[PDB]
Amino acid sequence: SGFRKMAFPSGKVEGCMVQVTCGTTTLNGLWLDDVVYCPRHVICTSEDMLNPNYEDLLIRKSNHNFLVQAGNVQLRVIGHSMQNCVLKLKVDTANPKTPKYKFVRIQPGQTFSVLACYNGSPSGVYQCAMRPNFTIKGSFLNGSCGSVGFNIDYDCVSFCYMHHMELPTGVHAGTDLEGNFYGPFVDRQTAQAAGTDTTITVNVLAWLYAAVINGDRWFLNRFTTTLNDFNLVAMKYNYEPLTQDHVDILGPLSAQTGIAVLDMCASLKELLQNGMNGRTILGSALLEDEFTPFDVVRQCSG
Amino acid sequence: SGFRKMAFPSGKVEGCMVQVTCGTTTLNGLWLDDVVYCPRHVICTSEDMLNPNYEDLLIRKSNHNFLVQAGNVQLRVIGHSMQNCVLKLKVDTANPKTPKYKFVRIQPGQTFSVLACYNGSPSGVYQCAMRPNFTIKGSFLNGSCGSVGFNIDYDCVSFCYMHHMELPTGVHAGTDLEGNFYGPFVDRQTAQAAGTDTTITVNVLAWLYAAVINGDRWFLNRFTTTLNDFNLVAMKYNYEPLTQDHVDILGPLSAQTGIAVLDMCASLKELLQNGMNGRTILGSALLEDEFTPFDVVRQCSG
Numbered sequence A, B: 001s002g003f004r005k006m007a008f009p010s011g012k013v014e015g016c017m018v019q020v021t022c023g024t025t026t027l028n029g030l031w032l033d034d035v036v037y038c039p040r041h042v043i044c045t046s047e048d049m050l051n052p053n054y055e056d057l058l059i060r061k062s063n064h065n066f067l068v069q070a071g072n073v074q075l076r077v078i079g080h081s082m083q084n085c086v087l088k089l090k091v092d093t094a095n096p097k098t099p100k101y102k103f104v105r106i107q108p109g110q111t112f113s114v115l116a117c118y119n120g121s122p123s124g125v126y127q128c129a130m131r132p133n134f135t136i137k138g139s140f141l142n143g144s145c146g147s148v149g150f151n152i153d154y155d156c157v158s159f160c161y162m163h164h165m166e167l168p169t170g171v172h173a174g175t176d177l178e179g180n181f182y183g184p185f186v187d188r189q190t191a192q193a194a195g196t197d198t199t200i201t202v203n204v205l206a207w208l209y210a211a212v213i214n215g216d217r218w219f220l221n222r223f224t225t226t227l228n229d230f231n232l233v234a235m236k237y238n239y240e241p242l243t244q245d246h247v248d249i250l251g252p253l254s255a256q257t258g259i260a261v262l263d264m265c266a267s268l269k270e271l272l273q274n275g276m277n278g279r280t281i282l283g284s285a286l287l288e289d290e291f292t293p294f295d296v297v298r299q300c301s302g
């Protein structure tokens, strides 16, 4: 028993991290078979970071302008191309540590692990959720660009995120591995800012179920509610609408605990309307929304 | 910027996890050079788990009673011995993935990463702190025994924890890698329970500094306090006494923020006496105590 924000084991991804240098700009890349993926803004200079024309900037580069360092080994760049906001550097050596992998794009409200890296060297691993406004509440310092986010299923690494920038509120923005940004963000310095965010209702309910599975029951009640009355409350508190598909997804947890999904909704309504009256749930005084139903099932006993 | 509970990258430890089976009991072991370390209660039966004499139980075993599986490879056991509450199985193959390593024992209030494993297969990584009462608030299911806790410095893995059991309150107990239990716990079924716990004051103050570094300043004030008046408050709220050595350890963070340690103490006193009045700090509505000054410095900008 116990419930923690848990990341996937990072070994498979650690084997793929490298350092990419162009000019005086150094950041991280992801080495898979004979290709290194990295943010295209490695080719920028502090002189054209405001409105860069990346096609122009790239045309003025050649293979030898890119230095790729894997551990203490120089990888020779033998081709280069852009795909959306990522650069693909073809290298003359296939990474012998390449895992089975996939490039997936994730949905807001889904979670993934982030391997924070600096100069091609991993420093830490943590769990994140893609917020409804397509940002992530990460932990990223200068040098972290190129760090990736991923999930692991069986032997297979599904890469879902590459890190590009930090917004004025301290939250983070990046792309999928095809170089397409999550959200209405661009890789150029502008006044761009996070849009308004909302709470991921289905995840809060999953976490309430985790709490019950782990013996926190003080917020339960004999009441129930309909989906529509619940969603009237959800709207009032800036929670996302709960759909019937969410109810269905919560089915396993509902059956394991014997607490019907709409009964849990009655509990969440009471918590929203009354607060916690000084109590905690799984060690938190706030309602947590970064655990999916899958995260809860994977971590919690059967 | 950003602040997250971050674990060390787990790759180096993943390379050392194996499965150990004795009879119908299967758990995890840690393979380093030609030795596998695991909890000695792998030799117990549900028949003698109440008051086992491990010396007797071990004497009745031979090398062939232990099945060690590394991935899909059987490791031949060629010797066996007990050291306190851990078993050392000498195997005929040195682990080629052995990292530079050390066996350290940690202090209450220090943090470490846990690699949760089942059947020798890592499933997740997370950050923990050793509580003042020598327990850890982990996430461990049946099958997790033998999972380890560690820190990484440069290339060197300092193993500090092996997992043995769960206590009635849902918290966890284990040993260092020499098999000596953390706390007044024993590897036999008794009524044993966690003793009273306290909050790690120096870590709360480190986390307040992290909050300032990350732009949360609402809890600051123009006041100050002496160490003794602060500790009178600390005692009242079941916080650990703050020593001058703790003040010294907080020096870097104090200098980086320009907020004297005793001024931060004045802030913590106000938060203890008044609560948070509906506000949060680094996304928490509770005062967090599982980040050491080192964790904050390592993660936060310079």
Ligand SMILES: *[C@](O)(C(=O)NC1CC1)[C@H](C[C@@H]1CCCNC1=O)NC(=O)[C@H](CC1CCCCC1)NC(=O)c1cc2ccccc2o1
Residues within 6 Å of the ligand: A025, A026, A027, A041, A044, A049, A140, A141, A142, A143, A144, A145, A164, A165, A166, A167, A168, A172, A186, A187, A188, A189, B001
């Ligand atoms: C990465 O480019 C990076 O790590 N580069 C390596 C070479 C050093 C950074 C990562 C940032 C750094 C700041 C702290 N957290 C973080 O995640 N990304 C940027 O610096 C990004 C770069 C621009 C350049 C054109 C393409 C993409 C954006 N810029 C910002 O994050 C950013 C935030 C502010 C705030 C105020 C003024 C400017 C600014 O830029």
Ligand SMILES: *[C@](O)(C(=O)NC1CC1)[C@H](C[C@@H]1CCCNC1=O)NC(=O)[C@H](CC1CCCCC1)NC(=O)c1cc2ccccc2o1
Residues within 6 Å of the ligand: A001, B025, B026, B027, B041, B044, B049, B140, B141, B142, B143, B144, B145, B164, B165, B166, B167, B168, B172, B186, B187, B188, B189
């Ligand atoms: C490990 O032994 C383990 O994983 N063994 C592998 C072979 C299956 C478990 C880990 C526990 C399991 C329960 C849930 N969380 C967790 O961390 N450890 C135990 O089961 C431990 C074993 C005894 C045996 C003698 C030596 C050490 C203790 N027992 C307990 O954790 C425990 C908790 C309770 C509560 C009520 C009755 C009994 C009990 O046992």
